[PDB]
Fold Hepatoma-derived growth factor-related protein 2.
Amino acid sequence: MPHAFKPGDLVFAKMKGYPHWPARIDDIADGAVKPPPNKYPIFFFGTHETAFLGPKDLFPYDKSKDKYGKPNKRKGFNEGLWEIQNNPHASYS
């Protein structure tokens, strides 16, 4: 059975106006800005941007990849597909 989201989990994350996007739940570094309550820090592969999202916008990657893991015209998207499949836990700083 599912647990709650934890750092390191791989997802497609949904933002208004954008396709479901390859992403991971990030850790929060010591001294770094924390997310609002009930939100997680989401790192978006390809763009390398961070937003704060709740579970309603987070789709586990294994279950969802057949639907959402297809190339997209959007900037950074196909780079993001490579990252989530080939090195999802690397440092992209």
Observations:
- Residues 10-28+38-86 form a domain with the SH3 type barrels. fold (CATH 2.30.30.140).
- The beta strands are 10-13, 21-25, 40-44, 50-53, 58-60.
- DSSP finds two helices and five strands in the chain.
- The first strand starts at residue 10 and ends at 13.
